[PDB]
Amino acid sequence: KLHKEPATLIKAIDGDTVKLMYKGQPMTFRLLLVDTPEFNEKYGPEASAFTKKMVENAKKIEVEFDKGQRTDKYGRGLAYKYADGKMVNEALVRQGLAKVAYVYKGNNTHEQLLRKAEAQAKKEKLNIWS
Numbered sequence: 001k002l003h004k005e006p007a008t009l010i011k012a013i014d015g016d017t018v019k020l021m022y023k024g025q026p027m028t029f030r031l032l033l034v035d036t037p038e039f040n041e042k043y044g045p046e047a048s049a050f051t052k053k054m055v056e057n058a059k060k061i062e063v064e065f066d067k068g069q070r071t072d073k074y075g076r077g078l079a080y081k082y083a084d085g086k087m088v089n090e091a092l093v094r095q096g097l098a099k100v101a102y103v104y105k106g107n108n109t110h111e112q113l114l115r116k117a118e119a120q121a122k123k124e125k126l127n128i129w130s
């Protein structure tokens with residue numbers, strides 16, 4: 001079963017990538033199951049600002065690795081991030097600032113939760129879906 005672990009914010013990079021201090025080591029983390037646009041693309045700045053605000057204003061930040069691989073080929077930690085108990089991955093998708101993507105079996109525990117959030121954002125024609 002999955003478990004949440006403490007992590008400290010170093011710096012928000014963009015919508016789905018952040019630098020955190022995990023177990024005393026500075027690491028770049030990439031959010032599982034989602035894809036925010038590049039800062040240079042439509043809604044890119046919006047997604048960056050959303051994530052930045054959410055992580056910087058948080059009292060507690062936690063990371064939750066899935067059951068599979070914990071890092072990607074670029075050395076980035078792969079996890080679900082929580083800001084005061086609220087999952088950032090889900091928040092972005094629910095806001096239509098990120099699409100469900102890179103769904104790989106083994107690291108897809110929250111796939112249904114995220115797809116539900118995407119469907120609602122799409123139904124509401126929010127941002128990316130506008």
Ligand SMILES: Cc1cn([C@H]2C[C@H](OP(=O)(O)O)[C@@H](COP(=O)(O)O)O2)c(=O)[nH]c1=O
Pocket residue numbers: 017030031032033034035036072073078101102104107
């Ligand atoms: C989210 C995620 C991304 N990735 C890789 C796939 C993509 O590789 P390629 O760059 O070779 O396409 C890249 C997408 O990241 P970004 O969306 O940050 O660019 O990160 C994984 O391997 N596993 C994951 O769980």
Ligand SMILES: [Ca+2]
Pocket residue numbers: 016035036037038
């Ligand atoms: Ca991206």
